[PDB]
Amino acid sequence: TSLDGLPETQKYVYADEWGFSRVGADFPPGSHPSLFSQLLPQALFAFDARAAVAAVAVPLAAMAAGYGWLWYMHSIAPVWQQALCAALIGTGYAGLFKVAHECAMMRFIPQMPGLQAALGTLLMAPALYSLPSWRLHHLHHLLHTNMLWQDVWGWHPLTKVELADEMVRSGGSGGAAMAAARLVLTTPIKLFASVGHWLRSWDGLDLRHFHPASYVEVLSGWAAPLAFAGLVLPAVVSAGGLSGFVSCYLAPWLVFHFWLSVLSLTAHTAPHIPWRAEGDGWDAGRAAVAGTVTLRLPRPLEVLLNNANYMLPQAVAPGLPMWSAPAAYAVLAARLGPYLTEASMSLKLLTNHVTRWQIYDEEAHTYRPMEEVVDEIEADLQQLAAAAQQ
Amino acid sequence: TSAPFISPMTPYVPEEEPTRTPPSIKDTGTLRPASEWYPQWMQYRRREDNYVFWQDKFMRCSTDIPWAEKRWTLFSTVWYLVQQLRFVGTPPALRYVAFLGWRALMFQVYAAHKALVLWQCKLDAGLARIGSGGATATFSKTMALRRLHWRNSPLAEALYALNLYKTGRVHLLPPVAKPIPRPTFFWLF
Amino acid sequence: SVKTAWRTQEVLRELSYTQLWALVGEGHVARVRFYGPEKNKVMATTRASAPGGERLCKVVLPPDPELLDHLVSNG
Amino acid sequence: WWREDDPYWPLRDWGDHPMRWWTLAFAAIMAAGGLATSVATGYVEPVQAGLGAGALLALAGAAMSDARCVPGALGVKLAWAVCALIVLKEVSVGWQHKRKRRLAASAPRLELTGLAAAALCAGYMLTDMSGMGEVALPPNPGAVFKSPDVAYRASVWQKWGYGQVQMRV
Amino acid sequence: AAVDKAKVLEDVRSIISTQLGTELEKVAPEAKFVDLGADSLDTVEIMMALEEKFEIALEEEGAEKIATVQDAADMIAAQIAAKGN
């Protein structure tokens, strides 16, 4: 809660300035994000075979159609046809990956835990992701949602005092670190920053970060990815050459990583959402429901990605199945309507994420552009130097 | 403190059974051979206290063998052929001549190693001068003895050379080298 | 092909009769040895410049009398 | 680097095998060389060998991160096995992409990667490979001849096919 | 265990004498090592000769604090004392 209670007219003009479909109402402290799970009917937690098999076999068919189309004209295709096939395959794999992320939290087919764990491992493998490290990081996210200095497995924002500290530690903005930060948080490569998250899994490939009674499970978790990049990745190259690798593997990879990064970045970032450190005003239900955003999709994309944008219906109910995530949302707006936040697909939203909302300041408790912030903390350096000439 | 019940101020490091038999009682840690029947120290103790010679013999030969020296592997069943050649297929006279030659060679090797150790102590005393810059031309007898008894790993002497050349501190020495265990793989070796 | 295989402990290739005939005609065979209990098996070693480099082939020479002049002609 | 308050920071027990960053370094070097050479030539063997070696050595260097446990021992085992197989293939069969027309020049000698793999096997053996020492060939009736226990010896005889021989012992 | 310090002291004196070139009755049981014609890179050679004569290994810290032939003899006697155990 940052731009909390004031007339709804200015929050609506803010929502139109930012492309947001709504801005939340006031939320009082002392609540549990599991509370509002008592509202949903006792049939929203139901199990059925047809919906799940559709959710797994539809993006599969998308990917298969894209591959068949490509292998039909393997490398004689032009550039934008290649881009179309890459986007289609990456979207199908994002859907399959959401099925994976479902069976990782044990809420896909609880009837067969072994079969569902094997399915999650198999479907995470082609993206080079270990199932148990993913599960640990996602629970560690849920526990610290929107907490400062604590949720590093989400989109932890870069704050002001730390950037001034690095400014002094590098001796100006001309070092490698400052230039890297600028170039990564200013250009559309930010929309692919999830790649860096993939390099923060494999926690140094170090079992000293885990609980001993889990070692044999963590290593097997690092096995299915490695084995893949040890067996299949060669074969492809062997049978396709360098170009034949940049086509059938790397581009769908960048597509899936784009989808992942933008989903998360738009789900938990907004100027009307503050990032408090706990002790200095944090709360579970507040930073859960009030500091969140839900995005809108075309129903084709929603049946492809398998409800990949409904993150709150399963943050109030961690055991809510996947084919019921829209329906549950239907109930939630009926109850917490004024406090919800919503948004849609718009290149304007992404452009504001790229150019406007770049640095988080805790004084105004909101996001600011990076060049203005950098010139102004250079001005504060001028200030402290003026206090230092004598 | 992963230990639920008891956690002394020093962490528990597990102990495991040894993998090789100790040096006999008679040999020095160095390269020079031994007195070949009776050690020289046996002469400065009471007759009733030198049962440790024959006791150490009984131990290394029959009584405490570490169960890692009785592993049957594909490598040991060919080393058996080699050793049985040496012990049953050769006449003791040629064995004796080879023994004498080997003793002489090892004595010369030890003399060379001692000379090299002395030269090393000079060089390190010389380099600690550049290091600390000032007065200390000194070395440590500790490091000379540890070099003569092969108690340092190469990384240790490298770190020590750097530490001398940068800060002097000729009395700050690497911790120690720990004993190498006996390599095992599987039925292979 | 030689680009889609693993190097494995090079063995004696096999030629029937005419690949060897064409090879001795083109001047690339460098040496031949006779063996067999029936005096008709040949091990043929080619020379460097030949297509494929120096290698070893195995050939069974069906009894034809104009082979001798053929080999001795091409060195 | 250097730390003037304790220069001997590496020679301190951190909980992992000493030859641990060498395993990962060699896996990275192997995968990089595999990809580089197999794209710059067109042969399919070097990249397959390099990526397999890299993946197995990376898994080994992961399990070697807790040297007290049992995985910390099976890791060094796997690493030694892989580097030994590399040395073997190099010095006995050579590399496919290093074939030439002559027959004495295209013969297998020991090149750089084999030397590095051999240094790795030696460094593994000289550090600690003493784990899992209860796996060997089973004992004969020749090891239980003078054993002080009758049930054990009868068991061994029975297994090796001598259950009927009389134990006048 | 029970070691005869007399013999050990006699032989340490003999070894020091023979090593430096000074006559045996001049090296007193309390004569230090620099006053008897030896520097720093020569108190280590006589340490090596002592180990070679008695066939034992000198502890290193105790060898950093040797200044009188008496303490040398005492270190050697303590080494020979704890041999079987």
Ligand SMILES: CC(C)CCC[C@@H](C)[C@H]1CC[C@H]2[C@@H]3CC=C4C[C@@H](OC(=O)CCC(=O)O)CC[C@]4(C)[C@H]3CC[C@]12C
């Ligand atoms: C080459 C491609 C096509 C196949 C797949 C390769 C991956 C399995 C590799 C490539 C990048 C690697 C990562 C690159 C960097 C690191 C850090 C490195 O650990 C450290 O540096 C320790 C911490 C520190 O040094 O501070 C080893 C693990 C990790 C995550 C590596 C894990 C294995 C990764 C993901």
